Amino acid sequence: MKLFISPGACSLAPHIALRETGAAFDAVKVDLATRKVETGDDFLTVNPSGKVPALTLDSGETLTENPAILLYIADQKPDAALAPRDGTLERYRLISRLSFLGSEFHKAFVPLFTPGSSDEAKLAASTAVKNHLGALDKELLDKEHYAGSEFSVADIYLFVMLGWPAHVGIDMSAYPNLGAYCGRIAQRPSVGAALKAEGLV
């Protein structure tokens, strides 16, 4: 199993998840600017869109999109309970949270990480992200975990994106429930090991 990454990108989420399940895997770096794998392979052969993450299974089939990859990884080690069982309401609430993170929260950041973007795109995206952070802050005031009863791929995915505001001029002091949440998650051995393997600490 090979996970295709770029350090600190949304690919960190499945990186942490594989460490949480103990799966055998290779973490392979991609140069997002040239779309080339560190091995020199053309990454567009693996993911035609050129984006990370991509997960190549032992069969040689490649899966894309964080929500699908993260569920796949959780489901291979049910004892880890990183996703609820098939046919529970909690399983749909998890998919809901993964779709919100990928479709709303992630995409809020894109102008802030585009040097091309206007002075006013950058400020409006600033606003959208700070709005998301305010609602996430109050949601996690009342609960330890982002989805259902216990630590899940949804917490892993949120945790990774809560590492982004500090790089685009947003002070995470305003969101102290998010602070503590990131605090607790960062102490997990899986999380420190992924942060170290990607060169982020």
51 torsion bin: left (phi>0), alpha (psi -120 to 50), beta (else):
beta
Q: Does 127 bind a second copy (CB under 8 A)?
A: no
Q: Does 102 bind a second copy (CB under 8 A)?
A: yes
* Shorter beta-carbon distance to ligand GSH: residue 85 or 167: 167
* Shorter beta-carbon distance to ligand GSH: residue 61 or 79: 61
- As measured in angstroms, the least distance from the Cβ of 187 to a second copy is 29
15 among the known binding-site residues?
no
132 among the known binding-site residues?
no
106 among the known binding-site residues?
yes
* Shorter beta-carbon distance to ligand GSH: residue 10 or 28: 10
Q: Does 102 bind ligand GSH (CB under 6 A)?
A: yes
* Shorter beta-carbon distance to a second copy: residue 55 or 185: 55
Binding mask 171-200 for a second copy (x = CB under 8 A): ------------------------------
